[PDB]
Ligand binder design. Structure first.
Ligand SMILES: [Ca+2]
Ligand SMILES: [Cl-]
Ligand code: NA
Length: 433
């Protein structure tokens, strides 16, 4: 028969889904369960193009499209299949839940989660010890209540919870290869409570992947929390290659009763476009957070970075940082690359430039403010202005032991202006007559 209205189990004895699955009700649902544990080697499962839909109005229980359990590796062949978890309820609707301790490779598939009342999550990684998850050509579309900041999560990777802190260490290796997150963010979180919780996520976004859209920016959210004797470390190693990301990146660290909590975000962006803002946020005396942002191989970043945590930005290989709002970092390094500050001021502690380029708007007051040591060589450009340039605007300010060499020319009214170092060490555009 074409459609099962009963839940289906796939396992070593039945690796093929052979009908659509459509479950409706007012109770908990798991429409399809993949049990890997009796597989002698890996398990290879095919959905045969069939769709899977779980819809429930249950308020305080879970709605799941697919659940993957057991302890063997599985490959899920989901090409042309749509896996849906939906229906209005307080508890989260999740298109696919993974508590298997084995690897999970997903080939294709469209994972959809909808919940207008509570949260919706595309894929949740819930193995106690962490999972390897690979998405090849997969699509995720999570739409919860937008009244909630965390309401729509494409990929949810949390260790621990409020009831029981997470005691131990876990690594989730998450790869998006030519995959598309249409809606929902990515959350990589450890809630240690009073335990010692250590969570490392290696998030690889590669080979033509897309997150969000210009008018639909998502959030990549990394968070660590702990209390008292507890301790929490959240590492997010975010590698982006040949891809397009419309997403903020948040590092949040939340400590109570002097528990040490650290959120370390390490971003490498290669041949990619990233549109979105980076933030650090520390709550509590012993909370620390950091952002290490490196653009290489002709990458473009359009966004801003701020927060009370530590942030470092490095650009190489003709990369561009197009600054969209006031930004503050500890350190900015530019090699054969461009920072465009036509629209906003960058504040940095240190600055190092090697064949670097600064784009300014000579008619604005958007400047490069370096509080500490600036070094190297920088070319400064501005489009011509119909109006004269303010010769008292320090378009580059430096701190001490600064050895930066900065040059450039622009046009203001009928005059040429030359970037000139003043007696104060800062750089100003000076009318050349
Ligand atoms: Ca932006
Ligand atoms: Cl606890
Ligand atoms: Na099969």
């Amino acid at each position: 028969s074409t459609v099962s209205t009963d839940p289906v189990t796939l396992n070593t004895e039945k690796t093929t889904l052979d009908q659509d699955v459509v479950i409706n009700g007012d109770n908990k649902i798991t429409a399809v369960t993949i049990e890997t544990s009796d597989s002698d080697k890996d398990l290879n499962v095919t959905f045969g193009g069939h769709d899977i839909t779980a819809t429930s109005t249950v308020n305080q229980d879970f709605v799941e499209g697919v659940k993957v359990s057991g302890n063997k590796n599985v490959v899920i062949n989901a090409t042309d299949s749509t896996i849906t978890a939906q229906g209005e309820g307080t508890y989260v609707r999740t298109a696919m839940v993974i508590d298997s301790t084995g690897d999970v490779v997903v080939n294709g598939g469209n994972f959809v989660a909808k919940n207008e009342k509570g949260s919706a999550t595309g894929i949740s990684l819930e193995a106690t010890t962490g999972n390897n998850l690979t998405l090849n050509g997969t699509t995720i579309n999570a739409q919860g209540n937008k009244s909630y900041s965390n309401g729509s999560t494409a990929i949810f990777a949390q260790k621990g919870n409020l009831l029981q802190g997470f005691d131990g260490d876990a690594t989730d290796n998450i790869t998006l290869a030519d995959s598309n997150i249409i809606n929902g963010g990515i959350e990589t979180i450890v809630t240690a409570g009073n335990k010692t919780g250590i969570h490392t996520v290696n998030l690889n976004i590669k080979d033509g992947s897309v997150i969000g859209a210009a008018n639909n920016k998502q959030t990549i959210y990394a968070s660590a929390s702990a209390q008292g004797a507890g301790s929490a470390t959240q590492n997010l190693n975010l590698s982006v290659a040949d891809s397009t990301i419309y997403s903020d990146v948040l590092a949040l660290s939340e400590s109570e009763n002097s528990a040490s909590t650290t959120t370390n975000v390490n971003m490498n962006v290669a041949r990619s476009y990233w549109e979105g803002n980076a933030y650090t946020f520390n709550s509590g005396d012993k909370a620390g957070s950091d952002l290490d942002i490196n653009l290489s191989d002709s990458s473009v970043w359009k966004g801003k970075v701020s927060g009370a945590g530590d942030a470092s930005v490095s650009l190489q290989n003709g990369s561009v940082w197009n600054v969209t709002g006031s930004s503050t970092v500890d350190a900015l390094a530019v090699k054969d690359s461009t920072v465009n500050i036509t629209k906003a001021t960058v504040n940095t502690g240190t600055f190092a430039s090697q064949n670097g380029t600064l784009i300014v708007d000579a008619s604005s007051e958007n400047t490069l403010d370096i509080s500490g040591k600036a070094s190297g060589d920088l070319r400064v450009y501005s489009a011509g202005s119909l109006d004269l340039i303010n010769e008292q605007t320090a378009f580059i300010s430096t701190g001490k032991d600064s050895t930066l060499k900065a040059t450039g020319t622009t046009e203001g009214g009928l005059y040429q202006y030359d970037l000139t170092q003043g007696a104060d060490g800062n750089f100003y555009f000076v009318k050349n007559t």
